[PDB]
Amino acid sequence: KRNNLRKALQEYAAKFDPCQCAPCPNNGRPTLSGTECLCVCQSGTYGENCEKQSPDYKSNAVDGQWGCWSSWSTCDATYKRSRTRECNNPAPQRGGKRCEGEKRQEEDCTFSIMENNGQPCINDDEEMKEVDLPEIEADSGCPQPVPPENGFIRNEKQLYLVGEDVEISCLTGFETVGYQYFRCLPDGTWRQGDVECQRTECIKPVVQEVLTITPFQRLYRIGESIELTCPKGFVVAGPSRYTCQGNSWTPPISNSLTCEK
Amino acid sequence: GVTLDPRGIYGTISRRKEFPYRIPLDLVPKTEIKRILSVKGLLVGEILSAVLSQEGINILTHLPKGSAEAELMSVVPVFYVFHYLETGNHWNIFHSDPLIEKQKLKKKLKEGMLSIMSYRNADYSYSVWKGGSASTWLTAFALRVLGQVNKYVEQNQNSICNSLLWLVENYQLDNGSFKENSQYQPIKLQGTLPVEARENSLYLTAFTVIGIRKAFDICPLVKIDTALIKADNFLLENTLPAQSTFTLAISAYALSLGDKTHPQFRSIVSALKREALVKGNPPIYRFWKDNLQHKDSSVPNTGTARMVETTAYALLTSLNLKDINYVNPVIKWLSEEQRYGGGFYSTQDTINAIEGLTEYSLLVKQLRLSMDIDVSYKHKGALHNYKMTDKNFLGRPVEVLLNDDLIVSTGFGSGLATVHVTTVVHKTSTSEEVCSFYLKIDTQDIYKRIVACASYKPSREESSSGSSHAVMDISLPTGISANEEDLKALVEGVDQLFTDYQIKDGHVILQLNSIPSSDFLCVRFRIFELFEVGFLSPAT
């Protein structure tokens, strides 16, 4: 309602901005009810819309005020539209004075992209609810089970129904022995079992800011090898070549081949 | 069991699967072997009708071209609004002849290719002007786009590969892995926010990986594979961008095209979850913000750009993990005025919003159930054939009968139905590794008395140390009862073996500390009968 209400104020101003009034006599500000303009008068000016003066006020003649904006000049060759106004209510002729506030606007050429289809309800406090408590959950079913060692749930939901199923499998180094779905039983359990992750690949270990290693591959198959390497002219720590072992290699990672380059 | 997948989901494709036939050694000799196969039609759930309007013609028919290449802002989103309409059958909604609109598109898009190519440098970089200083960022935007459009209209591979090799040769650092020439200014409605205060390397390394990944399908040569592996790895190893979800999201989205099953990638998205914004008890709407600096702007701003770009990258991360259940409350957030403008005619945002609906509408058609599934044996003939639709989603079990390897397959089609095969078997005690403690029992008249005899069996490398602690069950026919006060001797006697006993479900349970493998331990008890039944099942 706030967004819409700014947006209505923009349209309301476009319709009812008193810039559209004929020039105010004796340097009053034009003001518009919606259906009539009246001028707000300066000290020493009076009448319905400022038409007459006290004998002292006649000395001013400063006369600095706007007429309306032009419509938008379309995009400026950096995709920004603009518009300008021209100081052109009764001009600073006998005396001299600037009309106040920046003569021009620039506004990004923004337009709509998608099928309009109404508007959604939004309230200030809500959006920062990254976490909230588990619901009353009367459609009992099951919540997400914690997947096994090195595991990943393929289809993700808050609450799976009775007889509804979830698929799992091991991460990139690894493969499932056994059946890789589970299903929510009527009591709320998953009966997780008869599945086991096995290693088939290994991944470039964590190393110091000097590369003490040569990165041959994204993933290394078990029985392949990786090499610790000095950039030039020295030897420091760790095996020169290593092969992977169902576990990781037992690689040097507290320190690596940090040679005197 | 498996999902079938005729179309590509879960980083792979699954139009065919084969299940072996096994003959275990444990088996009861004269057994029958039995098997059952059934298939579940996994429907999409709800679909949210998220679309570009007929006004999508105004997104093609760009705002005034000009200097500093506002002509570039005029070319690039055409290469997306095409792809949306193409994946959406959408030209019909225009109400011209769709073919005339498709021909108009293919032509205007080719005019676009010459138009963007006109800003290529002889070094195959690009710039803000034809005479400007080169930019890797804009080289990477061009590579993101060229990666798109060669799925539709081909351009020669060298024109891509040289533009790649400018970037990949001259700016691929180590310990941090893509770098830039400091162009004059960020273009006020193109580029986007860097990492603002400092540390732009994450936004560079991500946006450059995002370009290079899109192009890499159309320049597959060894160098570029060698580059992206490290351009990812240094991005991954740097990526903990908690200072900005916009940085967490472009870094996540880049990595979503990578190895989707790398633990650091999974961890990054697990942080992206922890960063999410929601509304409702279940998630009704979902989106993201990082800088909590806020105004309810009716005309959008770079603050909106933080949201729309961080969200469009989270959305594209999720839509490269293929789950509409996760994606839905985001697609609800788009298309109606959360923080206005569909990308506000920032090209970067508006591109990423159109890309959102494109991958969403693709996944919608990939997921729907319109699939035909066949099952056969490997050496033997066909077993069954199934047709799976918005009505016939449940695929009833069919027996599996013929003792051969089982092949299930599909053609082209759509959806993600899953086929489950169960096997039933009966296995021996003595001829299997299930038994460590080998059993005998005898019933004799001297009401009657019963003596069990049994012994442990160690592994081949092990001595006669005896069995671990065990729970033993003497079953009896119903109405037969053991002499419990005689049984108390097994508990009271100085030569103790059992800790405790109980009667439960009519069975006699007793718990034994260890068992000899040196000899058969023998144990005797006595029974009285209040005979209860006409048929008695064998006791265990």
Q: What is the 3-state secondary structure (H, E, C) of B168-209?
A: HHHCCCCCCCCCCCCCCCCCCCCCCCCCCCCCCHHHHHHHHH
With vertex at residue B486, the alpha carbon angle to CA B481 and CA B489, rounded to the nearest 5 degrees, is 135
Q: Quick check: B298 contacting A, CB < 8 Å?
A: yes
A105 to each of A97, A102, A108, A112, how far by Cα in Å?
A: 21, 8, 10, 21
DSSP state of A67: -
| Spatial CB neighbours of A177, under 8 Å, sequence gap ≥ 6 | A195, A196, A197, A198
CA B503 to chain centre: 50
Query: Which chain B residue lies closest to A107 (C-alpha atoms)?
Result: B299
- Technique used: cryo-EM
Token pair of B160, please? 């891509």
Q: Quick check: B94 contacting A, CB < 8 Å?
A: no
Angle between helices B157-170 and B222-238 (to 10 degrees): 50
In sequence order, the β-bridge partners of residue B502 are B509
- Closest CA of chain B from A167, distance in Å: 9
Question: What resolution in angstroms does the PDB record give?
Answer: 3.5
Residues of A in contact with B39 (CB under 8 A): none
Closest residue to B262, CB basis, from A75, A158, A172: A172
Buried b (16+ CB within 10 A) or exposed e, B251-273: bbbbbbbbbbbbbbbbebbeebe
Residue in B431, B403, B423, B523 with CA at minimum distance from that of residue B473: B523
- Return d(Cα B455, Cα B514) in angstroms, integer: 10
Q: What is the DSSP string of B138-154?
A: HHHHHHHHHHHHTTTS-
Residues of A in contact with B326 (CB under 8 A): 156
Residues of A in contact with B325 (CB under 8 A): 155-157
Q: Quick check: B402 contacting A, CB < 8 Å?
A: no
By DSSP bridging, strand B371-377 and strand B2-3 are unpaired
Q: What are phi and psi of B36, to 5 degrees?
A: -140, 135
By DSSP bridging, strand B406-410 and strand B480-482 are unpaired
Mark which residues 309-328 of B lie under 8 Å from A by CB. 323, 325-326
Per the CB < 8 A criterion, the answer to whether B436 and B456 are in contact is: yes
Residue showing tokens 């109405």: B479
- Closest CA of chain A from B21, distance in Å: 15
Whether residues A130 and B274 touch (CB distance < 8 A) is answered with yes
Give the Cβ contact number of residue B124 at 10 Å: 19
Whether residues B281 and A132 touch (CB distance < 8 A) is answered with yes
Whether residues A167 and B3 touch (CB distance < 8 A) is answered with yes
Q: How many residues does chain A have?
A: 261
Sign of the dihedral through C-alpha A71, A74, A79, A84: negative
Per the CB < 8 A criterion, the answer to whether B360 and B50 are in contact is: yes
Q: Quick check: B464 contacting A, CB < 8 Å?
A: no
Query: Which chain A residue lies closest to B231 (C-alpha atoms)?
Result: A218
- Return d(Cα B93, Cα B88) in angstroms, integer: 10
With vertex at residue B44, the alpha carbon angle to CA B40 and CA B47, rounded to the nearest 5 degrees, is 160
Q: What ranges in B217-345 are assigned the alpha helix state H?
A: 222-238, 245-256, 263-274, 302-318, 324-333
Buried b (16+ CB within 10 A) or exposed e, B391-402: eeeebeeeebee
Q: Is B55 exposed, middle or buried (0-12, 13-18, 19+ CB in 10 A)?
A: middle
Closest residue to A113, CB basis, from B1, B323, B353: B353
- Return d(Cα B348, Cα B350) in angstroms, integer: 6
Cα atoms found within 13 Å of the Cα of residue A258, Cβ hemisphere only = 9
Residue in B167, B246, B252, B159 with CA at minimum distance from that of residue B199: B246
Sign of the dihedral through C-alpha B88, B94, B97, B100: negative
| Spatial CB neighbours of B534, under 8 Å, sequence gap ≥ 6 | none
Q: Quick check: B70 contacting A, CB < 8 Å?
A: yes
Q: Quick check: B347 contacting A, CB < 8 Å?
A: yes
Residues of B in contact with A207 (CB under 8 A): none
- Closest CA of chain B from A26, distance in Å: 37
Residues of A in contact with B334 (CB under 8 A): 114
- Closest CA of chain B from A25, distance in Å: 36
Whether residues B336 and A118 touch (CB distance < 8 A) is answered with yes
Closest residue to A155, CB basis, from B323, B333, B342: B323
Residue in B502, B493, B440, B449 with CA at minimum distance from that of residue B471: B502
Per the CB < 8 A criterion, the answer to whether A112 and B341 are in contact is: yes
Q: Is B204 exposed, middle or buried (0-12, 13-18, 19+ CB in 10 A)?
A: buried
Q: Quick check: B415 contacting A, CB < 8 Å?
A: no
Whether residues B420 and A181 touch (CB distance < 8 A) is answered with yes
| Spatial CB neighbours of A203, under 8 Å, sequence gap ≥ 6 | A172, A173, A218, A219, A220
Cα atoms found within 13 Å of the Cα of residue B454, Cβ hemisphere only = 22
- Return d(Cα B324, Cα B282) in angstroms, integer: 15
CA B119 to chain centre: 40
Q: Quick check: B22 contacting A, CB < 8 Å?
A: no
Q: What are phi and psi of A152, to 5 degrees?
A: -150, 120
Residues of A in contact with B184 (CB under 8 A): none
Residues of A in contact with B259 (CB under 8 A): 172, 218
By DSSP bridging, strand A220-221 and strand B5-9 are unpaired
Residue in B210, B203, B200, B205 with CA at minimum distance from that of residue B176: B205
Residue showing tokens 């493998």: B517
Residues of B in contact with A179 (CB under 8 A): 1
Q: What is the DSSP string of B57-100?
A: HHHHS-S---TTTHHHHHHTTHHHHHHHHHHHTTHHHHTS-HHH
Q: How many residues does chain B have?
A: 540
Whether residues B345 and A154 touch (CB distance < 8 A) is answered with no
Cα atoms found within 13 Å of the Cα of residue A6, Cβ hemisphere only = 10
Q: What are phi and psi of A227, to 5 degrees?
A: -120, 125
Query: Which chain A residue lies closest to B49 (C-alpha atoms)?
Result: A115
Whether residues A77 and B40 touch (CB distance < 8 A) is answered with no
- Return d(Cα A200, Cα A215) in angstroms, integer: 18
Whether residues A181 and B418 touch (CB distance < 8 A) is answered with yes
Q: Is A240 exposed, middle or buried (0-12, 13-18, 19+ CB in 10 A)?
A: exposed
Residue showing tokens 């639709």: B389
Query: Which chain A residue lies closest to B58 (C-alpha atoms)?
Result: A113
Q: Which of B58, B299, B301 to mutate to test the interface with A (most CBs of A within 10 A)?
A: B299
Pairs of CB atoms within 8 A across A/B? 164
- Return d(Cα A37, Cα A39) in angstroms, integer: 7
Q: Residue A202: which region, alpha, beta or left (left: phi > 0; alpha: psi -120 to 50)? A: beta
Residues of A in contact with B350 (CB under 8 A): 113
Q: Quick check: B304 contacting A, CB < 8 Å?
A: no
Residue in B516, B521, B523, B513 with CA at minimum distance from that of residue B470: B513
Residues of B in contact with A78 (CB under 8 A): 66, 68, 70, 187-189
- Return d(Cα B307, Cα B237) in angstroms, integer: 25
CA B397 to chain centre: 27
Q: What are phi and psi of A164, to 5 degrees?
A: -75, 150
| Spatial CB neighbours of B97, under 8 Å, sequence gap ≥ 6 | none
Angle between helices B324-333 and B347-367 (to 10 degrees): 140
- Return d(Cα B48, Cα A114) in angstroms, integer: 13
Q: Quick check: B485 contacting A, CB < 8 Å?
A: no
Mark which residues 160-189 of B lie under 8 Å from A by CB. 174-175, 187-189
- Return d(Cα B346, Cα B395) in angstroms, integer: 49
A8 to each of A2, A15, A84, A199, how far by Cα in Å?
A: 10, 10, 21, 62
Residues of B in contact with A209 (CB under 8 A): 175
In sequence order, the β-bridge partners of residue A225 are A243
Residue in B137, B340, B271 with CA at minimum distance from that of residue A7: B340
Query: What is the longest distance spanned by two Cα atoms in chain A?
Result: 105
Q: What are phi and psi of B372, to 5 degrees?
A: -125, 135
Per the CB < 8 A criterion, the answer to whether A110 and B305 are in contact is: no
Whether residues B262 and A171 touch (CB distance < 8 A) is answered with yes
Where chain B is discontinuous (C–N > 2.5 Å), the residues before each break are 446
B201 to each of B207, B235, B247, how far by Cα in Å?
A: 10, 9, 10
By DSSP bridging, strand A225-228 and strand A213-214 are antiparallel
Residues of B in contact with A211 (CB under 8 A): 174
In sequence order, the β-bridge partners of residue B287 are B277
- Return d(Cα B490, Cα B525) in angstroms, integer: 10
